[PDB]
Structure formats: C-alpha cells, structure tokens
Amino acid sequence: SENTIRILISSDPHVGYGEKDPVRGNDSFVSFNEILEIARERDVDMILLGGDIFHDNKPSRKALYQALRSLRLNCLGDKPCELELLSVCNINYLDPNINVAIPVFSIHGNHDRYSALDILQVTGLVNYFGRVPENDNIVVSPILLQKGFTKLALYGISNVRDERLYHSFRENKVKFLRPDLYRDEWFNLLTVHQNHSAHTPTSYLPESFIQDFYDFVLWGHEHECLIDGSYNPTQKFTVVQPGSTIATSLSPGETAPKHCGILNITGKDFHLEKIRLRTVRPFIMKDIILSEVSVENKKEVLTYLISKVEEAITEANAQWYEAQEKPPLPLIRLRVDYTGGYQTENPQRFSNRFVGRVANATDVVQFYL
Amino acid sequence: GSENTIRILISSDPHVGYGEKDPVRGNDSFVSFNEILEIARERDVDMILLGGDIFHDNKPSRKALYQALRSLRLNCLGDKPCELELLSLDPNINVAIPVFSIHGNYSALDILQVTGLVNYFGRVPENDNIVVSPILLQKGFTKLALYGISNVRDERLYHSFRENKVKFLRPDLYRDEWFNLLTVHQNHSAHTPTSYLPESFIQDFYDFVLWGHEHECLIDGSYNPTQKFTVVQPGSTIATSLSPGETAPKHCGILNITGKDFHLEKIRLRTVRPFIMKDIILSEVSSIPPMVENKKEVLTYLISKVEEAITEANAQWYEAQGKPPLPLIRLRVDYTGGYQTENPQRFSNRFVGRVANATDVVQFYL
Ligand SMILES: [Mn+2]
Ligand SMILES: [Mn+2]
Ligand SMILES: [Mn+2]
Ligand SMILES: [Mn+2]
After folding, report:
1. In sequence order, which residues have a C-beta less than 8 Å from that of residue A364 and are 6 or more positions away?
2. Do A348 and A322 share a structural domain?
3. DSSP state of A258
4. Residue of chain A whose alpha carbon sits nearest to that of B135
5. What is the B211 CA–ligand 4 centroid distance (Å)?
6. Which chain A positions have a beta carbon within 8 Å of B95's beta carbon?
C-alpha cells in the first residue's frame, strides 16, 4: 500500500454530448463525474484518461463548468490556509483523514489556445501529456513518478491521424526518450488514442509497432468496453481498452456494459480490477432476420417487433439493476433484415410509437436488406 | 511570526479583459490583475478581498477567462499534496490564499468560483430589499465579520436604506469581539442625492468599509467621525477611461487586523502604465495671441505640453518601480477666445509610437 501506485483508468468521457437533449442531456456530466467520484471513494493516487474529454471543439460554458465542478469536488481535496471559517477555505491541520489531491492525467483525442485543455490544465486540475507537435517526426517524453520504491514511466501519444501515424512508425520517426536513471527499473505505460483494428491496414495502429519495452498499454479512441484486456506475448505487454463512459452512437460496441479500472502497480507487477459504471444508461441492441422469422403483411411484423422492443426494455431494466426506484429511459436499437418479401414501415414512424418509453426518440430501428 | 493577525490584500475593479484587442494596451488588464495577486503572495497574506468589476466584459472571452485563472493558480492556489513524487509537506510549503469578492456591474465568474479560486459574496436576491449574511472568519483570537453588498443601482439602494429594507444579521455569540468589514460597490459621491450611497446610511457598528466601483485611488482612506469607521476606496488596477481620477498613481493595500484593531499598509503598483493629463486654458497663455492667425502658435504650445507630459510620465514610471511603456497622455484644452485648433485625431497621430493612445491626444472645448 506504501509502494503501490493506484491508477484509476478510463477513457473517452466526451463531456457535453447531447447537452441540449431533454432526456440524455445530462448523462455526459453525471458519468464523467462518476468516474472521478469512484477514484476518490477508492482512494487512488492518480487518474489516467485516454483522451476525447470534451465532445464539442469549443465546449459550452455549461460543459466547461460541469467538468471543472466534478474535477474540484473529487480531485482537489483540501486546501491549506491558517484561516478558519466559522460560518472552504477549510483548515487542514495534519489529521489522519486528510483529503489529498488526486491529479488527473490525459492525452488528447480527435475532439482534443484556448482551448478546452487550457482552462482545465491552467487550473492545475487536469494534466495533459503525450501531445505531438510534428506528425512527421514524433519525440515522446515520459512522465516519471515515484511512489515508495516503485517507479512509473508514463508515455503518451496524443491522437494522430492513423495513416500518418502508420508511416511515422514505419519510417522510424517515433523515438521514445527513455530515462537512464535506474534504467530497466521503470514500469512503462503507454497511453494512445488510435483505432485498434481497421478495415484498412494503414488506418490503425498495429500492436507490433509498439516497442517490447512497454509493460502496459492504455487504449483510447475505441469506445467498446474491453476492460479485462489482453496479453501480447511477442511484445510482452498487456493492453487495456477501457471503452467510453457514454454511448456516443447506437453501435454494437456501445452495448457492452461500461466499466473503468483501478490499476495497482507495485514495482513491476500489476493487478487490474474492473469496476462497473452505474451512471450509464442501458443500451440493448437486437438483430432480427426476416428469413429467421416464421406479401401483404403488416400486423404480423408490427406486433412482433413492438413486442420485441418491449422485450428489450425489460432486458435493459434488468441490467440497470445489475449495473447498480425507477430506472432511466433505456436506449433500444433493432437491426432488421426485411429481405424475403416482408412489408415494412417508416423508421421514425415506428420510433414515434415509443416516445416516453425509450430515450432514443428517433431511431429505434433500422431496416436493411 | 506570531500569529493573530488577519492580513488581507485589498483591491478593486481589476477589469480583466479591458482593451483586450488593442495592439499596445491589450495585455495591461491581465498583468495588473496578476500583479495584485503576485504581491499578495510576495507579502504572505492570509486572504484577498476585491470590491468587484473583476471582468470587464459580460461574457469575457476564452482568453480573458484563461488569464484570470492562470494568475489565480500561479499566485493563489498554493502547493497540492500529492503523495506522489514527480521526477520530471515540508516547512517551505505554499498555502492557499483565498480570494473573496462581491459583484460589480453559467457565468465566467461561476467558473472562477467552481474551480475554488474565488468566493463571490454579498449577492442580493432582490434589488428592492437587501439582507446581508456575513462570512465569519477567525485566525487565533481575532474574529472578522465580513459583510458584502454586490452592486445595486444607486437609486434603489438609497431607497432600500431610507425605507429600512436593508437588514444586517449580526452573530450573537462573542458580540463585540467581531471586527466588522463591509464591502460595497457603489458611487461614493453624486450630483443628485439619490444616485450615490451616503456613508451616513451605513450603520455605525462597522469599523472598515471597502469601497469598490470608484476607480480613482484614494488608498490613504478616510475616517468617519460620526459613524466611526474608516472607508478605503483603493481604486481600479487600470485606466478604464481618460478621466482625472484615473491619473492618480494606482495602489493596493495589505490590511492587518488584530482584535478590533487594524492598520493599513499601502503598496504602489508597478505594472500600471503611467497616465498624465493637463488641463489647459488658451486665454491663460502667452505666447498665444488672441484673435489672429494663431494655429501655428497654439500647435507648438500644445505639442510642447505633450512632450512635457511624456517626460513626467516616464519619470512617474520610475518612481513606481523602486524602459517605460508608452504613456497615456490627455490634454483638455479650452480654446475659447478666438484660437485656431486642429483635428483631434490628426493631432493625436503626431504621437504614434510615442503615446499609447494615438487616436485621442486632446479634447477641445468651450
Ligand atoms: Mn476518438
Ligand atoms: Mn471517442
Ligand atoms: Mn468599474
Ligand atoms: Mn463599477
């Protein structure tokens, strides 16, 4: 406990997504808050984030305020002054229960002077690292942290266009300034924000392009929770893609239940514990095939799908109780294949049928062939 | 070291953002507001107190907001824990210096407060009726009861006082151990008796009244024998106009309070640009021959006074420090009696790169 660095790890909070929305318009704020709230409740030493912190490129004053609020309420702790408030600005003393500062560390995403990072960072609440100035020639300088005997090297690469990144690695334009003080005695963390898999080989970052000396790799960008990770035995590291904290579209990857994680680093071994996020709105997606189901057909399709949406709703309620009075309006998406001569309907029309019952007021279904 | 003294840096109207987009003066507001806080730190005070008009603009820019927070973190935030050693609580730790302020005239200000760098107070729920709940502070045996009234249109405040609709909630425990400090942001003087706040309307139990909203530095303060308190109108930290009050050299003060006793130390601002102003009556001058083709003469006399004002300005910048920036120079010229004048901007352009307000160098009147 005295030589173990505790890092709460998450990614992609997307602060300010759907601000205007009359149902979901707060989700962003709430969950980014749950993230930092867990960190204090679980008493970690720092927070690491995978980038994509604000959604909008120029965030609202509301968004900026909300991130700041949650950052203070949880990560600032106690402020020292010889001035007591009788009726904080709160006297610290040197008590056993003293509220320490939990510094937040993040790289930048594709969303990420001045500048969203500038206001967070200048208040000393968020620390930005791994930023890249030239894409053609990158020089990654690490953060060096010491807790007890354990030493942690923290390397960062801010989001680079994947193709450009692909070539920079291939042409040797990505150097890692490693330290020579206690060389080979550091735990090396890499925090990136690129696609992990791609349709096109040059549009992602191959795990093989990441040098064997690294022990841990935090994977931003990708929103799907894969918090348990994977061990690359050729590069000898462990890759954790935490996923986002909010469902930023109705894709199958956003349906996997969101978590964050505490990375307990001691010396050179580590332990990672997954922690379910409660504040995230449930998202159940079902794929329906016309051929599988058993032409002048309206009633047969409509009743089935409407009773199939009411199926997902109760399945989504189940998982909010499992994740955790009334649960929040769930997100429901149906992918249906109406091949084989089946009578369809209007997409939004079907989605006006569930107003007040689902949170995605517009696209509850998509009809493909 | 003792310590039973509450030390408070007093200042007002920093007007962060004023003249943001000017090539020359663009950065004055930011630096002078930073100096205020830099001094507070150099002098190890316990807290900062401002009279309001912190931001010049209603919605200050993302730049204006950035600088204020930068200055607040650098000088006021102080050291943070963090139990983790970055390799790139001792006895030389830097403590937090809390900033308290009232309002002048999801705000940027709410950002200042939510970060935990400034505490807005003295808010008024209703303009017609004002109730003032005091912040109670204490450091040792010394007890400070800090009261605020954020700006109210002088006409309504006047009346709200006269009609006994302004109530002060005084704490009942240790009744007289409280040193009572009031922060206001109103006109101190006016030509009609309802558009300023008379010191007489302020209840006699106060001991020190901080007076924002009057930009002119009168930091030496004033004793009110009848009400028995001391009024200190520190002034702004930038010249927000070219008026006579803006000419008095800008200052801030550290206010040491022990028990019901106080003492005010005053500090000259270094970062404030010089501003000299000359009031000129052409009939009060020879060599300017009245009622004949005098334009050539008037011009040399005026151009010389400007030059003369520039030297006084440079000199005043050195007196303050203990190369100067381009000075602010205003000539208020009374041309009555048959004297020929020039275009004000033509005249002001004869000093581009020489003064900091080229567009305005003079004002002609009768
Ligand atoms: Mn991304
Ligand atoms: Mn993202
Ligand atoms: Mn003002
Ligand atoms: Mn004012």
Report:
1. A309, A332, A333, A334, A350, A351, A354, A358
2. yes
3. P
4. A87
5. 11
6. 80-82
Domain boundary among B273, B302, B328: B273
Residue reference for tokens 């062939």? A369
Query: What's the alpha-carbon Rg for chain B, to the nearest Å?
Result: 23
- Which one, of A40, A39, A13, A38, lies nearest residue A27 by Cα? A13
Nearest CB partner across the interface for B137, out of A5, A86, A125? A86
Choose one of A235, A250, A281: the last residue of a domain: A281
d(CA B46, CA B51): 17
Contact B86 A115 (CB under 8 A): no
The conformation of residue B73, written as its DSSP 8-state character, comes to I
Q: Do A161 and A290 have their domain in common?
A: no
Resolution (A): 3.0
- Which residues of B belong to the annotated binding site for Mn(2+)? 13, 15, 53, 105, 185, 213, 215
Count of all residues that appear for chain A in the document? 369
Q: Are B155 and B194 in contact (CB under 8 A)?
A: yes
State in Å: Cα B214 to ligand 4 middle.
7
| Domain total of chain A | 2
Which residue of chain B is at minimal alpha-carbon distance from A65? B111
Structural determination approach: X-ray
**Residue A21 annotated as binding site:** no
Looking at the fold, whether A366 and A266 belong to one and the same domain comes out as: no
In whole angstroms, give the CA distance from residue B116 to residue A125.
Answer: 11
Instruction: Output the six-digit token pair for B42.
Output: 């150099």
Is A52 annotated as a binding-site member? yes
Whether residues B70 and A122 touch (CB distance < 8 A) is answered with yes
Amino acid at B290: P
- Minimum-distance CB partner of A65 among B77, B88, B114: B114
| CATH code where residue A160 lies | 3.60.21.10
Assigned token pair, A211:
């040098």
Q: What is the identity of the amino acid at A126?
A: V
Token pair of A143 as six digits: 């953060």
Q: CA gyration radius for chain A?
A: 23
B265 and B279 part of one domain = no
- Spatial distance between the Cα atoms of A76 and B79, rounded to a whole number of angstroms: 11
Do B347 and B213 share a structural domain?
no
Strand segments (E) across B140-215: 142-149, 166-168, 178-184, 208-211
Yes or no, beta carbons of B110 and A85 under 8 Å apart: no
DSSP state of A15: B
**B103 C-alpha to center of ligand 4: Å?**
9
Three-state secondary-structure class, residue B95 = coil
If you ran DSSP here, which 8-state letter would residue A167 be given? H
Sheet of strand A104-106: strand arrangement: A126-128, A104-106, A46-49, A4-10, A259-266, A269-276
Q: Are residue A76 and residue A181 in the same domain, yes or no?
A: yes
A108 is catalytic: no
Structural domain harbouring A149: 1-281
Query: Which residues partner with B257 through β-bridges?
Result: B6, B262
A200 DSSP assignment:
S
CATH number at residue A353: 3.30.110.110
Encoded tokens for A236: 């000898």
Distance CA B321, CA B315 (A): 10
Nearest to B301 by CA among B250, B327, B339: B339
Backbone angles phi, psi at A134, to 5 degrees: -100, 130
CB A31 within 8 A of CB A280: yes
Closest CA to B331 of B294, B297, B357, B295: B357
Taking CA–CA distances from B93, the nearest residue in chain A reads: A80
Contact between residue A53 and residue A93 where contact means Cβ atoms under 8 Å apart: no
Indicate whether B263 and B279 sit together in one domain.
Answer: no
Q: DSSP character for A8?
A: E
Residue type, A144: L
B295 lies in the same domain as B269: no
